[PDB]
Design a protein around this ligand. Sequence first.
Ligand SMILES: NC(=O)c1ccc[n+]([C@@H]2O[C@H](COP(=O)([O-])OP(=O)(O)OC[C@H]3O[C@@H](n4cnc5c(N)ncnc54)[C@H](O)[C@@H]3O)[C@@H](O)[C@H]2O)c1
Lengths: 227, 227, 227, 243
Amino acid sequence: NKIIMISGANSGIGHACIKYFLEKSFHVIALDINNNNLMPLKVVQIDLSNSEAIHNLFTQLDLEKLSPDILINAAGIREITPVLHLSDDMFKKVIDVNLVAPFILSREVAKRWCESKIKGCIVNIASVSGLMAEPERAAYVASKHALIGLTKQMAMEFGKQNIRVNSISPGVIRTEALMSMIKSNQSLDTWGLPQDIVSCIEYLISDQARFITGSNFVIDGGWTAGK
Amino acid sequence: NKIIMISGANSGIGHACIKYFLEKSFHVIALDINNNNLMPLKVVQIDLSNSEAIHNLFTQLDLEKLSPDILINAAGIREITPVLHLSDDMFKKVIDVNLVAPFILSREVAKRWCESKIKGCIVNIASVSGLMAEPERAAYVASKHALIGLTKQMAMEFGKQNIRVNSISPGVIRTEALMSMIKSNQSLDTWGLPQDIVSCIEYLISDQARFITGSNFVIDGGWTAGK
Amino acid sequence: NKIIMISGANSGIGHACIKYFLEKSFHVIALDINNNNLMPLKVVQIDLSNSEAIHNLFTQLDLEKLSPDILINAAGIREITPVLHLSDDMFKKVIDVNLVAPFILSREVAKRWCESKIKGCIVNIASVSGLMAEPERAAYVASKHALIGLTKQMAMEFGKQNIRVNSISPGVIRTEALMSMIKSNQSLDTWGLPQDIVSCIEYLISDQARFITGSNFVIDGGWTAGK
Amino acid sequence: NKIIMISGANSGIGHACIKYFLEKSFHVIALDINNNNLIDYMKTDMPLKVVQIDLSNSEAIHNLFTQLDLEKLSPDILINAAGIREITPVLHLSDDMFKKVIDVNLVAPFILSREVAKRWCESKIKGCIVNIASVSGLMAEPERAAYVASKHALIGLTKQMAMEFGKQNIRVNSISPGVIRTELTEEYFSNKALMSMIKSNQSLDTWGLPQDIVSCIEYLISDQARFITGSNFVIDGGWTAGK
Ligand SMILES: NC(=O)c1ccc[n+]([C@@H]2O[C@H](COP(=O)([O-])OP(=O)(O)OC[C@H]3O[C@@H](n4cnc5c(N)ncnc54)[C@H](O)[C@@H]3O)[C@@H](O)[C@H]2O)c1
């Protein structure tokens, strides 16, 4: 049975992955700082902004001889703040969760894949804000741009070991007047849903994605096509 | 049953779509200038650089009530000529097949979908050369960049009518020493195959792609990630 | 003195180059289909959609020994028509002017540069519609994406002969309530002007641009930054 | 005279900016963690202020701004040229080192940019920021996870802050250099094989020099760049055009 590690598991996209992949017979390691909305399911309570906590997670996984075959980096925070009111710590904290955690989680799984000869695969959940900016999101935009780059780099780094690394860039996804604004910035007059991102994860981890690495799949209703 | 029109049907990616989609119970209209390598299948021998033959084909299909639900623009040519020896006609012809035909085919199917309120979708087969240039490929590069732009523009044009328009950008696909230079430009030490593109076409016309429009799906073994 | 050939010379960006570079002691060959808004200036009346007229233009220049050192492809047309009303001839005409003429003109000056060992340079005037789509502009969008791709390819092609090829992508330039929609789509509350493009041209054809080829310079008041 | 604050002033691109802008009569604020190559200049009466600072330390950046405010120095222009670049397999890239690259290459540009913009918005001044990214902000390479991530990030940051401050006439742009011969890349130029590999990945058979970047900075901060914001100007000899 494939083991899949999923960050941000308590909410939104990450949460919608849990039920779905458990139902397809995956063993699931769920990571999140909350667990209130959470079968071979291991739940870990972890603040992914703390690199020491990640490192203790991995010591505990190596002691239980448990290593995932697949990593989904779906934890994310989004500041909602004018840039002049964005503190040094809030900027860093967004970068810690949105970029540093995926880096560290990825380096750790990849180390274990390379040593065992496993053909792992990683899916990074970025955003349309990884390709286009928006007001009041200096840290979110920067971090999501970074994660797209990281995805491309790690694909190159680990490709000769058959480890695939790709990203998904969601547009407006409905989760945990405005609507008019959303519609006039999209081509389609519909909302994305979590399951639209889950199906793309499913495709990107499948055998049918064997030649796919370093790619960013945009799932945005047309947001990024233009103005 | 759904009708899917597929250009470049006689060879490579378009040919691999024919049988695959026949086996999934699609009715198929196959377009190609050759037919030597070609069940509800209609085969049309057509030179897609001739816009008047395209116009006639649509008149015929309207009289037979055989207007497609899905269009796959997979016909393509690539020059292999230094730019100083690339004649006006060679440049025009590559543009006529790789961009003008997809434009006309798309406008025609979309005309019919807006009249009849059908939720059709287009998949355009672009190339990594639509993102990164190469030597001796001025027309191929220009037309593939153009086709990515066209995909964006038509996604926006028709989104309110729930017609989705997407592109796939293949890397080196094995179709009808150099092997080492390919591995050198890729992250993965494997060859893309027609089926890697067919599975992506299949995902992009499926219900699970309902929120996907204007997007370009790169399927290239890491080619475009970097150097 | 350096000779600079400028297309689209009767209007907007190309016209603004004429006086400016004449005043800087360039010899100028001006190309346009009209001449009413038109010293070592050579004016040529020419329909750049007509490929044989371009061939005749070069036949004339070779007799006069007037081969340019610098080419600025500023001729352009943009359709204003919904895509379903965009005819085959009109799509092809936009393509022939916006892409094919830059290609032919570029290949012919590059041929002369390579024979004479001259360090030529080309500047292609693309558009923000070369990066992002908009409604009712299928041809304009496709053609300007194409031109960005052509610029990248010809830079690679001719790099070893020290021929530089770059592009400029203007946003809203004032040339020959809507004013508020333009402000909502830009970061700056000002209008672009032809001189903004002309100064970039002047930098791109200077000795200070020795290491600049294949690049696309965006001059758009923030239009392409996001939404 | 204009005041221009330049990070990475001790070496490379930043040093060449210090020299170039001093020669054109700007008042220069030079920021760098090292100062050996600025000592001679500090002994003259050139209008050069040198601050020794570790830009990876956010509290030290805050102390910089306390010092600038006490000395009445508000720059008109910020050049974020300080940057670092690891050369290491990703599996050997430690948490602290990934973060140090991010801190210098991203966080510091963000903090310095927010602070200058804050003072420009209060005083109604038309400021200008130029961020030095990299071709690695567009195309990845092996053994550069932090560098590639950071440079991608800085391009994004550039676009975001352009949009944020555009109504206040604060322009924010980036430059993405390819291979520029400076102290950071001087390794490469004695190695004949690596020179071939660089030439093979470029369209032009030359190298960039620090002045190719200084000239672009001069353009982007001029009146002739009044309509340019959020943009990224690639200066790479054709590196990024393709393969
Ligand atoms: N030389 C190149 O080929 C090249 C290529 C792409 C991008 N770049 C970018 O250009 C910028 C400058 O590069 P360079 O070639 O001049 O490098 P350099 O190393 O010669 O100069 C960088 C300067 O930044 C300073 N710096 C580094 N960390 C710092 C810290 N914590 N606090 C204060 N100062 C610090 C250094 O001490 C140094 O003086 C960097 O952002 C680099 O990433 C350079």
